[PDB]
Amino acid sequence: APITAYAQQTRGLLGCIITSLTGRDKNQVEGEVQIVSTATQTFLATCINGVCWTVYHGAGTRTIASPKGPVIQMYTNVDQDLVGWPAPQGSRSLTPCTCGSSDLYLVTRHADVIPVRRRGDSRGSLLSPRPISYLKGSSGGPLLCPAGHAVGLFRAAVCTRGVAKAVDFIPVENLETTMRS
Amino acid sequence: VEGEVQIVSTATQTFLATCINGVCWTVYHGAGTRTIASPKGPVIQMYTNVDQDLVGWPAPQGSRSLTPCTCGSSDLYLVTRHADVIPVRRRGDSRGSLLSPRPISYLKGSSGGPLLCPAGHAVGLFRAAVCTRGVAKAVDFIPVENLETTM
């Protein structure tokens, strides 16, 4: 079927803050991509093969709030710009791509999927250039192949004059090596 | 929750309408030049491209607009009035083959529905089923470019 996505806000500003400090989240989890926040910035996190991966430039070395209190990161790789925690209970995991396709689809924090043409192991180009403002908050989001499998996690926008024309991502391979580290 | 696809009806038949770029498009052979109902009275068609079997009214309430495709994929998906998804391989400008033919009844009442690409973006509007002995094996469709041209 075609890739479709929807977004749902499960928590607000004040509840987010209290939860950040407390580190205890009793809310139920659903979905394969979680919208995530710290008191400083908001980004995305993607569950692949049972691990909730996200961008290090967003999560830093922080723990993730869970119903059992904060959870310590399973993987941290400042270089790869990755962090991973055990996937929250209730989440659904994506599976790594096994077809090396060059036609990728980026899911933004607004639940939109945009086509991206793979131009390297970690780069791809937007078929329809969007302003980086639209991409703000999407670091850590998934880059899916036509089969709905994870190819990479969005990391940075390649833009000029404020218009994103390409994107840099973390290919799934970096995940396997980072876990091995 | 807002829908991109509206299930519509006239006294004669029932079909589908698809919201793309703020317009609620459907097939002329279903809507004709009929006006669409709203809580404030009938609203007239913004476009009536009889030649392309295309009509459009301003997007109604409870709907959200679909985005046109830009990946040029040939791997299309047809959404029926029953919410069924059907893989269709694009054969040309406005033709495609069902990866698995179904009785025309399975595609019955879905005209006006959308033809989507691997990213869920609008590729075209389902115009007519191409039958062979009551089995739909291909479909005719109005490319999004035509909708974009009509407006």
Binding site: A1, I3, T4, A5, Y6, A7, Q8, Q9, T10, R11, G12, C16, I17, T19, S20, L21, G23, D25, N27, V29, E30, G31, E32, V33, Q34, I35, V36, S37, T38, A39, T42, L44, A45, G58, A59, R62, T63, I64, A65, P70, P88, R92, L94, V107, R109, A111, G141, P142, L144, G148 | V1, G3, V5, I7, G62, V79, H82, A83, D84, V85
Partner: peptide
């Protein structure tokens, strides 16, 4: 620092559905 908090979700597993009515 404080913990990273889940403030929303994005679901990819949803398939077309006829929105229920009353």
């Amino acid at each position: 620092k404080g913990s990273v908090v889940i403030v929303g979700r994005i679901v990819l597993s949803g398939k077309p559905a006829i929105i229920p009515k009353k």
